[PDB]
Amino acid sequence: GSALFLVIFAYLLGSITFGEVIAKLKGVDLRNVGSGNVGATNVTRALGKKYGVLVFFLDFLKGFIPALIAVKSFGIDSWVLTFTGLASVLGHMYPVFFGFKGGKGVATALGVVFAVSPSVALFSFLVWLGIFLWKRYVSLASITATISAFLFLFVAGYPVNVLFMAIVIGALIIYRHRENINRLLTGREHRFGTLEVLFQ
Ligand SMILES: CCCCCCCC/C=C\CCCCCCCC(=O)OC[C@H](O)CO
Ligand SMILES: CCCCCCCC/C=C\CCCCCCCC(=O)OC[C@H](O)CO
Ligand SMILES: CCCCCCCC/C=C\CCCCCCCC(=O)OC[C@H](O)CO
Ligand SMILES: CCCCCCCC/C=C\CCCCCCCC(=O)OC[C@H](O)CO
Ligand SMILES: O=P(O)(O)OC[C@H](O)CO
């Protein structure tokens, strides 16, 4: 079963949290530093910007490659794509190889949305960039850009399987951001500023 095989492969590949991998092989436990997350932001806090951008690239590929196989092999309207993108995001969030504690799924979801539509991923990235340049909170930018990815796919008239994939990935990412959210509502969320400019 090529479809079921590809969903399983998206989940197993997504389970490779490269922030955990690169941090542990660099000698660091990400759960202790920063937000406790295993993604590019916390990897940047823990190991510098070089390793964060690499882990972002890898977690992005985790979602891009299986979703691209799904779109090319079954079509943009196939539910194999829905379950492939969901499998990558869930594999990144609940990794089978790392005790089912992983990240919040933003980079991988960006891979999925890029395989679906590079232009939607472009404008969603522009949303993220605007929010981060404006308010200097990574999480706020990620939440807004996720919701906006759904909004763009909706306004473009993308099929129902893709809109459902986006609704579920988005709800997943927000839920995984709940603690960032209450940190934002409490004034205790990390704000990037000239301290990182000087010492990152
Ligand atoms: C938890 C977050 C929300 C999750 C929301 C959905 C949950 C569904 C659960 C299990 C079935 C999915 C497993 C899919 C297995 C492969 C799918 C497949 O084979 O699709 C081919 C199909 O014939 C094309 O029409
Ligand atoms: C080995 C099997 C691998 C197969 C795939 C394994 C991962 C699927 C597990 C959970 C999906 C999570 C979906 C969201 C969970 C619900 C969150 C929630 O509602 O939390 C409770 C409460 O609301 C708090 O206030
Ligand atoms: C179908 C649903 C899909 C939803 C898709 C949402 C798309 C959001 C777009 C881009 C996020 C990019 C975020 C990462 C950018 C760089 C992160 C990073 O490393 O930042 C740390 C620090 O800023 C370094 O100094
Ligand atoms: C036709 C479609 C109908 C459905 C459309 C749904 C749209 C998404 C709605 C809400 C955001 C999802 C996540 C919201 C946050 C839930 C998790 C949270 O923060 O809960 C507190 C925490 O779990 C501690 O208890
Ligand atoms: O501030 P963090 O460490 O929770 O990161 C939020 C980002 O959306 C994770 O990529």
Curated annotation (Swiss-Prot):
List the record's Gene Ontology CC terms alphabetically. plasma membrane
Protein topology in the membrane: Multi-pass membrane protein
What are the record keywords, sorted?
Answer: Cell inner membrane, Cell membrane, Lipid biosynthesis, Lipid metabolism, Membrane, Phospholipid biosynthesis, Phospholipid metabolism, Transferase, Transmembrane, Transmembrane helix
| Biological pathway | Lipid metabolism; phospholipid metabolism
Per the record's keyword annotation, is Transport included, yes or no? no
Catalytic reaction list = an acyl phosphate + sn-glycerol 3-phosphate = a 1-acyl-sn-glycero-3-phosphate + phosphate
Question: Which EC numbers characterise this protein's activity in its record?
Answer: 2.3.1.275
Q: Where in the cell is it found?
A: Cell inner membrane
InterPro entries per record:
G3P_acylTferase_PlsY
One GO term of the biological process aspect: phospholipid biosynthetic process
A Pfam family of this chain: G3P_acyltransf
What's one GO MF term for it? acyl-phosphate glycerol-3-phosphate acyltransferase activity
Report TM segments.
Answer: 3-23, 51-71, 80-100, 112-132, 149-169
Name the major location: membrane
Q: Give the family from UniProt.
A: Belongs to the PlsY family.
The cross-references to PANTHER family, in alphabetical order and at most eight, read: GLYCEROL-3-PHOSPHATE ACYLTRANSFERASE-RELATED, INNER MEMBRANE PROTEIN YGIH
Q: What does this protein do?
A: Catalyzes the transfer of an acyl group from acyl-phosphate (acyl-PO(4)) to glycerol-3-phosphate (G3P) to form lysophosphatidic acid (LPA). This enzyme utilizes acyl-phosphate as fatty acyl donor, but not acyl-CoA or acyl-ACP.
What interactions and quaternary structure are annotated? Probably interacts with PlsX.
Please report the name of this protein according to its UniProt entry: Glycerol-3-phosphate acyltransferase
Organism annotation: Aquifex aeolicus (strain VF5)
The taxonomic lineage of its organism, from the top, reads: Bacteria, Pseudomonadati, Aquificota, Aquificia, Aquificales
Which gene is annotated as encoding this protein in its UniProt record?
plsY
